[PDB]
Write a protein that binds this DNA or RNA. Structure first.
Lengths: 180, 94, 52, 166
RNA sequence: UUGACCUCAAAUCAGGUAGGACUACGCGCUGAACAAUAAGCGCAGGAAAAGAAAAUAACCAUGAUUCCCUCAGUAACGGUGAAGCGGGAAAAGCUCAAAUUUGAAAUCUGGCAACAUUUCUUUUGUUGUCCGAGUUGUAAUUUCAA
RNA sequence: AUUGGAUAUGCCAUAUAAAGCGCUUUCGAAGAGUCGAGUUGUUUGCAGCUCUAAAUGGGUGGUAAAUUUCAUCUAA
RNA sequence: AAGAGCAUAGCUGUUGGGACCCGAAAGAUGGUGAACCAUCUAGUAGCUGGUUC
């Protein structure tokens, strides 16, 4: 009917106490899980880099952690996503690598180190993941010289005619198969 | 990808990595077990009347009418052409 | 009377900062303090600063 | 297993064997009550893949409905109204005649001690799952009310939002 | 002459369970003179419903559901009126059927005797044993991400 | 007074064990009066009615072309 | 053709919401009794009346 917002300060305070209660419940481990570096899917936003849902099975396979170990230690796994450009392989890989590097796993069963989890345990600290693992934007270039070969490259020689070539490709292909 | 925006090559020029084949796409693949089961059920269950009617239409070379009638029964051309081809293989097998 | 009367009102954030600075600067003028009603007839200094 | 043959046979619904068996069974079901307990499903493969297991607690009731709201949905609601102490898991189709649609409906005993100790089916015990078909939460009910995932499928418009600062 | 198995009865047999009320909020069916509304009927919970893609898109690609802002009074339809993308709140994943263990039904309810445990002499189990359920299929393994 | 679960400790446990990941010399079963088509009603969705599927099949779209490639997903 | 708009408050006008207030038969839904009741309803009002220093 008429949705009023008189609870807006109240709802904000609820979330704060929700985070504080949640964080204090699992204090040793970080409050926010890590997320991969992913690119928005459209021509308007494809230049940007944002945080996705999880790391694809290709990346965990490359990073040397199983899809079971990753879930236990706080690495979300996304099965739907598939990463095709091997940079997206890369940019997510060392992201997992540095996360593992800064990660300290408390040994189970009374602090006897199992496999390679850890030895020290007093280093228990709850840190913001976006601090140690911030997501960066695209690395833009600065001060590149020459490219006078691109000078003679007179833009529309590609744009105007290749756009026309793309537009007429179907008719052209139909022509070639016709007189053949 | 000619480092450009347009054309029937367009895209940002990178080195695509050959992604693996996922098990969801496996659907439609034939199993020798299920192919055997379908053979058994075909041999024991029989045929509905409408494919019965169309097959002597193939037998007496009445192909066009059977194709049209098969289209009327199912609804789509691909279902109809898929039907008649498998009955014909049955016809030559017999 | 309905609850959805417009109770809260927006103010430009820069205008808010403008007015806060003006009130701060106004707190350093002994004439303004006396007119507002404070008794600063024997204050050593406006502005007044005590140690840490 | 022998189940693979079963649904492949079940798919050929215009086969003479199925055509005969439908009629003799339809003649019989007309002469029992409109709803009646069945010792074992007439299509074990269909019930099995719908969540039925041959263990104590699961029960099958056969029912028929006049043709001419879905026939499937009306089957469950009538069964749930009849076996009012059970949670009805699912339902499936069996037979027709010129006038009737015959269904077999799977129900699970929520208070039975075999169901409560079986983790795969304890979810039905929890109180939110009682009389789902009166709420339209079953397989047919969920499909009937148009619920799914896609573009293909009210009070977020008629309400007026008046924020604190506007 | 007897015993099985099946179908159906009967018990003031043992154990359980359903009704009814509230209904602000949930989910249905029906539905008017506005409105997929009011009224009517059905059924729940502390939340409900939805939910791990038979979803988007056409990109350097996104990745369960729910909610908020934006898209946008735009597309679309002819006054009605979205959604993808983006930002944020919250994040959590999974289970069966479809194949066998055939060198062992390994599974399960209940009766009885003990051992316990309790929010609790009021609860919840365990062990043993017996009996029944169950090969028209209870277990283990597997669910397409495989 | 109980309880929150962690910490340490003590005692049993059974543990002849099973599982994760290098590889495969391969096999991969995958939900039917359902999907769908026509038809009638009602607000593409659903529903009655008659017909009724299939295995790289099926759904869905960018393309083409009115068919096609391509993309994406795996319903009952 | 050497950008002038954006945000906030106020006034006034207009459009829509009960819409300055009061007042028409009627119609629907569901009930009670052998017409009545409650909701939709604060309706259709192109008018009548009133409208405060």
């Amino acid at each position: 009917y008429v949705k009023t917002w008189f609870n807006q300060p109240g709802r904000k305070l609820r979330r704060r106490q929700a985070r504080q209660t949640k964080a204090a419940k699992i204090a040793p481990r970080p409050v926010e899980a890590i997320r991969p570096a992913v690119k928005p899917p459209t021509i308007r936003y494809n230049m940007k880099v944002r945080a996705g849902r999880g790391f694809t099975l290709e990346e965990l396979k490359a990073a040397g952690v199983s899809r079971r170990v990753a879930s236990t230690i706080g690495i979300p796994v996304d099965h739907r996503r598939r990463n095709r450009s091997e940079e997206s392989l890369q940019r997510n890989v060392e992201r997992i690598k540095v996360y593992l590097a800064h990660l300290i796993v408390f040994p189970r069963k009374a602090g006897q180190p199992k496999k390679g989890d850890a030895t020290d345990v007093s280093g228990a600290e709850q840190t913001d993941v976006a601090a140690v693992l911030p997501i960066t934007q695209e690395a833009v270039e600065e001060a590149k010289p020459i490219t006078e070969e691109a000078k003679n490259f007179n833009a529309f020689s590609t744009l105007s005619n290749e756009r026309a070539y793309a537009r007429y490709a179907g008719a052209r292909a139909a022509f070639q198969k016709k007189r053949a | 990808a000619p480092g450009l925006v347009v054309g029937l090559n367009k895209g940002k020029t990178l080195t695509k990595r050959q992604l693996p084949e996922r098990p969801s796409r496996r659907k439609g693949h034939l199993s020798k077990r299920t192919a055997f089961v379908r053979s058994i059920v075909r041999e024991v269950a029989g045929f509905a009347p409408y494919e019965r009617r169309v097959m002597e239409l193939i037998r007496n070379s009445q192909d066009k009418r059977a194709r049209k009638l098969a289209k009327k029964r199912l609804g789509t051309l691909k279902r109809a052409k898929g039907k008649i081809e498998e009955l014909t293989s049955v016809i030559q097998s017999s | 009377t309905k609850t959805w009367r417009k109770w809260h009102v927006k103010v430009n954030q820069n205008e808010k900062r403008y007015a806060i600075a003006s009130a701060v600067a106004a707190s350093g003028v002994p004439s303004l303090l006396l007119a507002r009603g404070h008794r600063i007839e024997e204050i050593p200094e406006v502005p007044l600063v005590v140690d840490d | 297993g022998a189940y693979k043959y079963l649904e492949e046979l079940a798919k050929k619904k215009q086969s003479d064997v199925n055509l005969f068996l439908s009629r003799v069974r339809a003649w019989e079901y007309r002469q029992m009550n409109v709803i009646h307990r069945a010792s074992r499903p007439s299509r074990p493969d269909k019930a099995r893949r719908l969540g039925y297991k041959a263990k104590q607690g699961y029960v099958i009731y056969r029912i028929r409905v006049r043709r001419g709201r879905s026939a499937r949905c009306t089957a469950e609601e009538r069964v749930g109204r009849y076996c009012s102490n059970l949670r009805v898991l699912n339902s499936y189709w069996v037979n027709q005649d010129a006038t009737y649609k015959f269904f077999e409906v799977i129900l699970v005993d929520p208070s039975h001690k075999a169901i409560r100790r079986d983790p795969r089916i304890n979810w039905i015990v929890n109180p939110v799952h009682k009389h789902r078909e009166s709420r339209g939460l079953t397989s047919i009910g969920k499909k009937s009310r148009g619920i799914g995932k896609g573009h293909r499928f009210w009070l977020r418009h008629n309400t007026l939002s008046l924020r604190r600062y506007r």
